[PDB]
Amino acid sequence: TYKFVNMREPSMDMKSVTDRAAQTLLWTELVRGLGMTLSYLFREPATINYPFEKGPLSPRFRGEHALRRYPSGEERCIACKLCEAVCPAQAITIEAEPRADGSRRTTRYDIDMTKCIYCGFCQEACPVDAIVEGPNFEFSTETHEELLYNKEKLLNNGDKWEAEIAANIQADYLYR
């Protein structure tokens, strides 16, 4: 099925021609829009007072990457390198090693934020929920080197945004 959009040709009686002549001469649709915009002027302005008020978000929000850790304090990352094999932009780099305790943690774990495209593929790839993307988006930096994160920076991110990530995961792990 389909509908013809513009076939409504006008009539030609005296009333219709008088109405059309009035609309053309005594500008009416012009006044119609001019009055609609007036109605929008008196309405309630849609505007959020940044940074005092922030936009609504969701528990699935993808933002700054961070390396979580177990309740015992041990980092969850076992350096399976699945996230490195998954990142479409290849922004993740890991070097692993047999630690002094033995658990295979990352000697190097850096995410190039300028290469990252913020997809959330790493977290869904992680089999221990080690790498995640925190709710933070307020990390606009001044130098390009500031963006290139390190393992220590990722650990600090996971130790600062931690109650956030734990609460969001608790509210989202059932969906995923």
Partner: protein, 55 residues
């Protein structure tokens, strides 16, 4: 981000409609953001028998 009835009648007449039925705003009618944990369902081939991947 409701208004005065004097302004309320002015905007409606200028807009030529009853816009109070639904505004571009969004008040308390929104969905709650603390929904209970959803128990997600499963797919068809979740049985433990006659689930041979060959077929």
């Amino acid at each position: 981000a409701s208004a005065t009835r004097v302004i309320q009648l002015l905007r409606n007449w200028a807009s030529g409609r009853d816009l109070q039925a639904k505004l571009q705003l969004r008040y308390q009618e929104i969905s709650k953001r603390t929904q209970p944990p959803p128990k997600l369902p499963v797919g068809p081939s979740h049985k433990l028998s006659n689930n041979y991947y060959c077929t």
